[PDB]
Amino acid sequence: GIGIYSPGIWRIPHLEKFLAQPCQKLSLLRPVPQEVNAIAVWGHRPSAAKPVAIAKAAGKPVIRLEDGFVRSLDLGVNGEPPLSLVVDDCGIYYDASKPSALEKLVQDKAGNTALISQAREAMHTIVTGDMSKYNLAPAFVADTNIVLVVDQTFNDMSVTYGNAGPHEFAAMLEAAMAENPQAEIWVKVHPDVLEGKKTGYFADLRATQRVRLIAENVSPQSLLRHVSRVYVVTSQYGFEALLAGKPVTCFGQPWYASWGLTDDRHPQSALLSARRGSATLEELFAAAYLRYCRYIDPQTGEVSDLFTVLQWLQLQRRH
Numbered sequence: 001g002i003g004i005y006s007p008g009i010w011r012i013p014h015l016e017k018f019l020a021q022p023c024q025k026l027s028l029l030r031p032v033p034q035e036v037n038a039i040a041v042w043g044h045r046p047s048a049a050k051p052v053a054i055a056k057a058a059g060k061p062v063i064r065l066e067d068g069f070v071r072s073l074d075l076g077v078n079g080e081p082p083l084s085l086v087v088d089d090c091g092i093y094y095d096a097s098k099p100s101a102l103e104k105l106v107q108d109k110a111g112n113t114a115l116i117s118q119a120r121e122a123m124h125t126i127v128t129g130d131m132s133k134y135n136l137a138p139a140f141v142a143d144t145n146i147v148l149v150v151d152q153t154f155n156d157m158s159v160t161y162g163n164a165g166p167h168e169f170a171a172m173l174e175a176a177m178a179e180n181p182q183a184e185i186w187v188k189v190h191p192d193v194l195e196g197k198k199t200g201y202f203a204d205l206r207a208t209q210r211v212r213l214i215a216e217n218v219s220p221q222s223l224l225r226h227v228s229r230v231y232v233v234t235s236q237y238g239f240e241a242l243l244a245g246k247p248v249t250c251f252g253q254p255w256y257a258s259w260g261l262t263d264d265r266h267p268q269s270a271l272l273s274a275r276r277g278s279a280t281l282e283e284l285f286a287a288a289y290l291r292y293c294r295y296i297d298p299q300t301g302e303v304s305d306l307f308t309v310l311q312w313l314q315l316q317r318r319h
């Protein structure tokens with residue numbers, strides 16, 4: 001079956017329902033058993049490197065896991081288990097350097113066309129139901145040329161493997177201010193940073209003149225309703241802004257950039273766009289949320305689907 005080296009992965013409740021194959025615990029100090037057909041690791045976490053090297057030396061395929069795009073109520077850093085995982089047998093969605101399984105699913109346009117009705121339905125529920133990767137934050141309350149600038153957690157692997165770093169956050173903020181000289185600039189702090197368990201790229205930024213720091217945990221769709229445009233490096237927020245109908249400028253190379261839907265500023269955007277080609281928003285959504293992500297039922301733990309997870313999350317949110 002699938003070999004697992006990381007105790008953290010092994011402890012994910014209902015892991016075998018996400019992987020849809022039996023899983024077995026392996027030792028880094030013993031040969032890979034013959035019955036193991038693939039090895040699973042978590043993204044590019046440092047713990048992945050040695051299992052990946054073993055897999056390659058043993059001729060076994062590598063599967064990289066990560067959290068789903070609609071994951072849970074509370075944050076991962078707070079211990080809440082995931083209701084959704086991505087399962088990538090090629091790379092990982094946030095690594096722009098080569099195709100990922102997600103990239104290939106987006107490029108399979110016929111497969112995505114078959115899911116247009118499901119995609120439209122789920123997109124509508126996510127936007128109008130105010131859902132996101134995490135789902136405990138209250139709705140934002142406003143009181144209007146507003147430009148949203150999205151911070152991330154320092155050294156997020158989606159930044160590093162998306163060909164970005166501190167420089168792109170500085171360039172992004174400078175561009176937002178220079179390109180919108182009369183707007184209010186809202187810098188949104190990431191919730192893991194608000195929880196105190198991480199630091200953000202704008203940690204040293206002084207709230208100043210036209211720049212307001214949004215240091216509150218609020219649901220993205222509710223906040224996006226009040227902004228005119230969104231600047232990101234690689235945050236999932238950028239895709240959520242596309243769902244909300246807002247223009248998105250991208251300074252890194254996230255999974256949703258370079259398809260023709262974003263104002264891409266990264267110096268390699270032309271090269272990534274040549275590899276990816278074009279895709280529509282509904283194609284990207286179907287590939288990412290309906291084909292790439294896998295779900296369990298929040299009440300039974302059995303294999304499930306996005307619609308059931310959305311239905312349950314909106315239950316919990318009505319309070």
Ligand SMILES: Nc1ccn([C@@H]2O[C@H](COP(=O)(O)O)[C@@H](O)[C@H]2O)c(=O)n1
Nearest residue numbers: 132133150151152188189190235236237
């Ligand atoms: N500045 C930010 C960055 C992320 N987020 C939340 O964190 C989720 C994951 O975003 P990242 O990809 O930036 O980690 C988003 O879907 C959103 O719910 C936020 O609310 N404010």
Ligand SMILES: [Cl-]
Nearest residue numbers: 041042047048
């Ligand atoms: Cl790992």
